[PDB]
Amino acid sequence: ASLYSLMSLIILATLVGNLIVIISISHFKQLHTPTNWLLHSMAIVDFLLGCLIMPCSMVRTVERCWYFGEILCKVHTSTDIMLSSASIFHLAFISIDRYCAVCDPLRYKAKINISTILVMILVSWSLPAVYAFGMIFLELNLKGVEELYSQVSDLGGCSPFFSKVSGVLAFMTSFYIPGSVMLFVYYRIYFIAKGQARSINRKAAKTLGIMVGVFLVCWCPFFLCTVLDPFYVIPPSLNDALYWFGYLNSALNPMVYAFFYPWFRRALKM
Numbered sequence: 001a002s003l004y005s006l007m008s009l010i011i012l013a014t015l016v017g018n019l020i021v022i023i024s025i026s027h028f029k030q031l032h033t034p035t036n037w038l039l040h041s042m043a044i045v046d047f048l049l050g051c052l053i054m055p056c057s058m059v060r061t062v063e064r065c066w067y068f069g070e071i072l073c074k075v076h077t078s079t080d081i082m083l084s085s086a087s088i089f090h091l092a093f094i095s096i097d098r099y100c101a102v103c104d105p106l107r108y109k110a111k112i113n114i115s116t117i118l119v120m121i122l123v124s125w126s127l128p129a130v131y132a133f134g135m136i137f138l139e140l141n142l143k144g145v146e147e148l149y150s151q152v153s154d155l156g157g158c159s160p161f162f163s164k165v166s167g168v169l170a171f172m173t174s175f176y177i178p179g180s181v182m183l184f185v186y187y188r189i190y191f192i193a194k195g196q197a198r199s200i201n202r203k204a205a206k207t208l209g210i211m212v213g214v215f216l217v218c219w220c221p222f223f224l225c226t227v228l229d230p231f232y233v234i235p236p237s238l239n240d241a242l243y244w245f246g247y248l249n250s251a252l253n254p255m256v257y258a259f260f261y262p263w264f265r266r267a268l269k270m
């Protein structure tokens, strides 16, 4: 229906959007710097996520029940968590790269060599993976809220249904730490980038605004709901609209960090 065709659009958009990043960057021997390796890796992560999770998840929400079979479920949701705890981390390390240009600008190249960038890619793909799988594979969403998951007998649907202290921990680490680093950085860049045009006069707001705005509107609603419910009036059907918000964010990530800019456009429009 409306939902079906519409959600397929998003998945395809993600796939075609990111293969572009990866084709342009790997073989051009004009783009061999430390920064691009991040937009490459984010492309990769969003790609994998898109293709495997999205279509499985897309089957699930045009229905009330998961019927794939339960041995599969746990694998699946952990993959969803891992791949996105990856996307948010990627945005934060890009922030540090950008902070480091517009502050210590005499030392930048030395500090951001390809070795640093390598650590930044391994950490991004390691800690999300591990944590998601370890948590959901040792019966650790529910420890104390076991019966409910009533919520999985009749409902039998893969919902990350979190326990009381589960919501606080998961929400905190992935939204609160990655969210805060970003805000500090962009705040300072507003004051410096706008302060300079004082001197040269005798743009910043649009760019920085559009980056932070996207992230927040796409994630704040799903995550706020999540920490709250262990304190359970929320409904099942409405709760779903929030997952898909995260997935939509993933597409627009390529447009915001690798196409708004002229170098990409010119090289791609060769």
Ligand SMILES: [NH3+]C1CCCCC1
Pocket: 080, 081, 084, 085, 160, 170, 243, 246
């Ligand atoms: N959709 C999921 C992504 C992060 C973990 C909990 C929600």
